[PDB]
């Protein structure tokens, strides 16, 4: 009966940060995701190039991300979940990029990657923490004898969902839902609550 | 590099929960200690029996514990820490006893043990998650390539502190302080902040 709820960040609790950053700054180029560029090391090399070409330092970038908001209903959902589970966020975001949004969620433990910042505050590099990081985080909780219930919205979440004791697709695209019928797929926070209740070994209230 | 701050709960952020609870009830028989009964299983079995004899269901217990508050300054300290680190609380108490205190700290991730609750809300047993749970939690975060900075107040916390990359003693007894000089020993939240800054590999502000 010892359970950790692991959540993806972008698309589950907050908007896709780079697309939202692109929308705020008018830099259309930054709307690009893995659907356009598969290799995260390349995409991260590129995104950082574009930022530097626009003279956007870390402080500048954080100013923009500070104007973003959690998805409607997301904070209430996190509050509900924290009353019932230990809540850990597993994301391929970066600490320095996501900080203003994480504050609005009450800074739940976040397991993600980091940036490399020079003495002039420029984003020159990044470090991926490890391979298959969300799956490996689930393994770490299993080593502590936790049952893990995980929710994610995209293909890059399916290893986490498969490794967990129970996985839930939230707001997932139809292709993903069709490819992974083993996970319940829901698209409202209330329904997501109900899937956490179904997956739990405990008797919990909605 | 990437840093998790692990905090012991009781004595660092909140009062010793069992002892405070037993005092608040006025029931002398609930006040027996590990000194009176050094076998923990026998002690816990006795506690559960006396609770039941006095009709104290989980809801009654939590109502009493909900009158406890975090130590003066602990709320601010947790907030300060969450701006700078990923924060995880480690404890040898039970989820059901800590829940009303955790709520007051914004429900940071808590890795601890669990009680067994029957359908009538009676406390009918307990489950320890694993041996040396705090030390093993540090090992789990190391398996995800985190550097761990830990703080604790007791002799038993020293396994956790030794396992961490940096350990800090907070409100520790003289015997612990002197036998473990490798951990800086402090007793105010401001000094605790300063020890987290010293232990960090990153440039962080007070
Ligand atoms: Mg996502
Ligand atoms: Mg999505
Ligand atoms: Mg303690
Ligand atoms: Mg103490």
């Amino acid at each position: 009966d010892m359970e950790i709820a692991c959540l993806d960040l972008e698309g589950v609790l907050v908007p896709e940060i780079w697309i939202a950053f692109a929308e705020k700054t008018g830099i259309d180029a930054l709307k690009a995701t893995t659907r356009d560029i598969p290799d995260y090391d390349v995409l991260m090399k590129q995104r950082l190039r574009i930022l530097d070409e626009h003279g956007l330092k870390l402080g500048d970038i954080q100013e923009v991300i500070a104007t973003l908001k959690p998805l409607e209903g997301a904070v209430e959902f996190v509050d509900w979940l924290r009353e019932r589970f230990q809540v850990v966020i597993l994301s391929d975001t970066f600490y320095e990029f996501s900080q203003p949004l994480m504050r609005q969620l009450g800074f739940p433990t976040l397991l993600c990657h980091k940036l490399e910042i020079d003495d002039s505050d420029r984003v020159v590099g990044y470090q991926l923490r490890q391979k298959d990081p969300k799956r490996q985080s689930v393994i770490a909780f299993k080593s502590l004898y936790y049952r893990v219930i995980a929710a994610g919205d995209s293909y890059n979440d399916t290893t986490m969902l498969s490794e967990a004791h129970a996985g839930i697709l939230f707001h997932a695209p139809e292709n993903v839902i069709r490819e992974f019928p083993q996970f319940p797929a829901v698209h409202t926070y209330e329904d997501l609550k109900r899937e956490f209740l179904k997956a739990s070994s405990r008797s919990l209230s909605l």
Side-chain angles (χ1 to χ4, degrees), chain A residues 29-196:
Chain A
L30 290 167
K31 268 179 220 161
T33 54
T34 53
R35 317 146 204 136
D36 325 89
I37 292 119
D39 191 321
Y40 208 55
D41 279 298
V42 166
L43 168 75
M44 295 312 308
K45 260 151 204 158
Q46 159 165 312
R47 275 164 167 170
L48 296 208
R49 192 211 95 223
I50 292 161
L51 290 171
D52 177 84
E53 282 168 7
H54 288 247
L56 291 163
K57 318 194 144 188
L58 186 64
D60 302 313
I61 294 159
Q62 287 175 328
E63 283 174 10
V64 178
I65 285 159
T67 70
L68 310 180
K69 298 195 202 170
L71 305 171
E72 189 185 8
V75 170
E76 194 279 334
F77 171 72
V78 170
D79 288 340
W80 180 90
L81 202 69
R82 289 199 289 220
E83 287 186 309
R84 291 163 178 73
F85 298 91
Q86 306 310 318
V87 176
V88 175
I89 312 303
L90 305 188
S91 173
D92 284 320
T93 196
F94 305 86
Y95 286 108
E96 307 93 324
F97 282 156
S98 61
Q99 193 187 39
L101 276 167
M102 297 309 300
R103 183 179 299 270
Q104 306 188 55
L105 307 170
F107 286 134
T109 310
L110 175 58
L111 308 182
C112 68
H113 303 302
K114 75 113 191 234
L115 297 170
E116 241 136 76
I117 312 297
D118 65 30
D119 274 284
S120 68
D121 209 51
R122 294 165 103 166
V123 193
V124 287
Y126 61 105
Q127 185 163 129
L128 300 188
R129 193 185 73 250
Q130 65 189 305
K131 288 194 207 196
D132 207 4
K134 308 186 186 201
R135 189 203 157 195
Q136 297 307 291
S137 296
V138 177
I139 291 161
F141 294 116
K142 286 181 162 185
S143 84
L144 302 180
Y145 300 89
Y146 285 97
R147 183 151 195 276
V148 176
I149 303 166
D153 68 312
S154 93
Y155 199 74
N156 90 320
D157 297 316
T158 54
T159 65
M160 166 186 71
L161 298 183
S162 288
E163 193 60 45
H165 300 261
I168 305 158
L169 283 164
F170 182 59
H171 280 301
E174 282 289 330
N175 82 96
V176 172
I177 297 172
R178 290 161 152 102
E179 193 178 344
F180 298 87
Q182 61 269 42
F183 307 126
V186 297
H187 68 271
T188 70
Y189 289 110
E190 290 304 297
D191 276 349
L192 187 57
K193 296 180 184 171
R194 286 170 185 115
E195 295 296 332
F196 273 96

